[PDB]
Every structure is written in C-alpha cells, then in structure tokens.
From Swiss-Prot, chain A:
The gene is fib. One of its GO terms (molecular function) is complement binding. Keywords: Secreted, Signal, Virulence. It comes from the Bacteria. One of its GO terms (cellular component) is extracellular space. Extracellular fibrinogen-binding protein that plays an important role in virulence. By interacting with the alpha chain of fibrinogen and its derivative fibrin, enhances a non-functional interaction between fibrinogen and platelets and is responsible for repression of fibrinogen-dependent platelet aggregation. In addition, assembles a fibrinogen protective shield around the bacteria which results in impaired phagocytic clearance by the host. It comes from Staphylococcus aureus (strain Newman). The chain holds residues 101 to 165 of 165 of the full protein. This is Fibrinogen-binding protein. It is found in: Secreted. Interacts with host fibrinogen alpha chain/FGA. Interacts with host complement protein C3.
Curated annotation (Swiss-Prot), chain B:
Changing K294A: Impaired binding of C3d to CR2. The gene is C3. It comes from Homo sapiens (Human). Changing D39A: Minor effect on binding of C3d to CR2. The lineage of its organism: Eukaryota, Metazoa, Chordata, Craniata, Vertebrata. Disulfide bonds join C111-C168. This is Complement C3d fragment.
Length: 65, 297
C-alpha cells in the first residue's frame, strides 16, 4: 500500500505545482505543473481534470518569461 | 556550456500537423521538439513568448488527431485497419513522453502503447520486432538500414520504454522486466556490432540503465571518428542522428570530458531540422542539445 502513498503524493505535488503556476505564470512553472498533473493516477480522474482545467486557464491568461 | 542554437534558426519548426497516422507524427515532431528546446534554452522572451501558445496549440492538435489512429489494442498505424507498427507505436511513446511537460497527455494512451509493445512485440530473448513497417520509411531515420535491425530496433523501442518509465511505472507491471530483457539482448551482442549508428543508439539505450561500461563503453567511445562524431557511409542525416544518440549516452555517463568536441561537431553541422526525411534527425539533435544545455557544467 506504499502505492497508495505514491499516488497520494503525486496528487499533492500536482496540486502544489498547479497552485504555484497560478502564482508565477512562467514557462518553467507551466512545465512542472503540466508534467505533475499528467502523472496523477486515473484514480483521481476528477481532481486531475480540475487541475488540468486550471492549467489551461492560466495559459488563457498568458505567460510572462 | 556552449552557446545555445539561435531561436531564429528554428522558426520553421512550428508546423501544422496533418495527414494520417504516420504523417501526423511527422508534422508533430518538429513543433514538439522546437518548443522543448526553446523552453530549455529559455529563448521565448527574446523571440516571441506568445508564439509559444500557438505552438502548444499545434501540439494539442497533433496529439488529438493522433488519437484517431489509436487502435483498440493501444497500438498505432497509418490507418486504423492497417496492422499496427511496432516502430510507430514506440515513436508515439517517445514523442508523447517528451511532451508531458507541454500539454495534457493521457497516461493510459501512453502506457497502453507501452504495455502492448511488451506483451505483443517482444521476443523471449528481449528483441523487439516490427511486423508491419510504416509506409513512410523516410521517417524512421537510420533504422531504414537493413543490417543489425534487431539491435537497432530493440535499442529504439527500449529507449522509448525508458523515457516512458516515470509516466508508466505505477501502471505497467511488466515494464521493469521488459527493460531488463531488452538490455540483456543489447549487451550480449554489443561487441559484435559493426555500424556506428547501432553502436550509438544501442549505446544510449545501455547507458540509461548503467550497462554501458567496461569493454562495451570502450567500444562505444572508440567507434567515434576523431572523437567527435559517429558516422557510417550513407546519408549525412543518419550520422547527425547517430551522433545525437551518442551525445545523450555521454550525458548519461556524465563523461563531460568527451562531450565538448561532440557538441561542437553537431553545432558546426548547422542542421536545423525540417523537411522530407528529417524526422529522426530533427527530433534527436534537438533532444540531445536540450539535454546538453540542461546537464553540462
């Protein structure tokens, strides 16, 4: 069940980096957030969609450096 | 480090993907790799930060269109009713793996293709076979050569499985074992290789799993011409592709003493990708230079 902790950690990592992307809007932050989200298990198919939707929105706002 | 390849030389790489299962990947390649390189070398500001969103849009479009060619088995081919290609499916994994930093990518699509390659196309001795060659033979680069095909293709598929590992670890149980078996095969036949191309690609594949050492590493290093390139008599494009695989191997080994001459040769080729039959050269040279820009001291 360490596999449950890994998946839970991927989820936290994603949530953190996505929140961080929303804060800096950099290309660097975009990459970390996007990769992190793509790593979240389909187990969290729903919050994964919400996180991804959040990424797409920051992209709609525009990046800066 | 050396100077980055100027962003202006890369503007023609932002392309619209079109065509069927193979052609779509031919169009997707340059745009994915260009963005990857420009992101790593941080040239968006002094080049057009907004152009990046358009490029991401084209990547999104390629990805989406490629899904229309995903067969029930998770494998890919030019058309949905054409027998699936081992190389194309592995190439899709390779490209989508590098694009996980750029757009949304479905893990099940990616790992479904990895799983299929393992379960259906890997022999018990670790070799990966192609039962339905792609129509666009110009898109597979140096693998078009008929000699040392089992080695060249196994190295190619193994490279894709290794780059997908992070993404597919938790959902593809057989992945670790498959990587090992393919490695075993490459290792047992590496010393008998004759072509610089195979030496280089199997070299990178072995280096990623720390099995390129001792006499194998010596073979890899001494194959280089003037210590700065891996070449064979044939098209110059395969040599640019080979040398790029070799550079990735060297970076994997952290042999930064041997790296400088290789990067210099690559830069002096002034190869900026794009055009007919440039798929592997374009994707590889820039993946290699990006990795270099990211690793080298």
């Amino acid at each position: 069940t360490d596999a449950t902790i890994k998946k839970e950690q991927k989820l936290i990592q994603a949530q953190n980096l996505v929140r961080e992307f929303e804060k800096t809007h950099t290309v660097s932050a975009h990459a970390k957030a996007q990769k992190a989200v793509n790593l979240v298990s389909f187990e969290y198919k729903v919050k994964k969609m919400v996180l991804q939707e959040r990424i797409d929105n920051v992209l709609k706002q525009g990046l800066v450096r | 480090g050396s100077r980055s390849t100027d962003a202006e030389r890369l503007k023609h790489l932002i392309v619209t993907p079109s065509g069927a299962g193979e052609q779509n990947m031919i169009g997707m390649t340059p745009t994915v790799i260009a963005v990857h390189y420009l992101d790593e070398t941080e040239q968006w500001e002094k080049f057009g930060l907004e152009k990046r969103q358009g490029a991401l849009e084209l990547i999104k479009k390629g990805y989406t269109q490629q899904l229309a060619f995903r067969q029930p088995s998770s494998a890919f081919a030019a058309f949905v009713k054409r027998a699936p290609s081992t190389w194309l499916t592995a190439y899709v994994v390779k490209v989508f793996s590098l694009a996980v930093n750029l757009i949304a990518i479905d893990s099940q699509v990616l790992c479904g293709a990895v799983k299929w390659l393992i379960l259906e196309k890997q022999k018990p001795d670790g070799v990966f076979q192609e039962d339905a060659p792609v129509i666009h033979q110009e898109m597979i680069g140096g693998l078009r050569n008929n000699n040392e095909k089992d080695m060249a293709l196994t190295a190619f598929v193994l490279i894709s499985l290794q780059e997908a590992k992070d993404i597919c670890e938790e959902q593809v149980n057989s992945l670790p074992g498959s990587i090992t078996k393919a490695g075993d095969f490459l290792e047992a036949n590496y010393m008998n290789l004759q072509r610089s191309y195979t030496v280089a690609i199997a070299g990178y594949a072995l280096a990623q799993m720390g099995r390129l050492k001792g006499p194998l590493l010596n073979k890899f290093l001494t194959t280089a011409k003037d210590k700065n390139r891996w070449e064979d008599p044939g098209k110059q494009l395969y040599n640019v592709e080979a040398t790029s695989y070799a550079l990735l191997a060297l970076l994997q080994l952290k042999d930064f003493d041997f790296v400088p001459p290789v990067v210099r040769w690559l830069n002096e080729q002034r190869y900026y990708g794009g055009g007919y039959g440039s798929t592997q050269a374009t994707f590889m040279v820039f993946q290699a230079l990006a990795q270099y820009q990211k690793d080298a001291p």
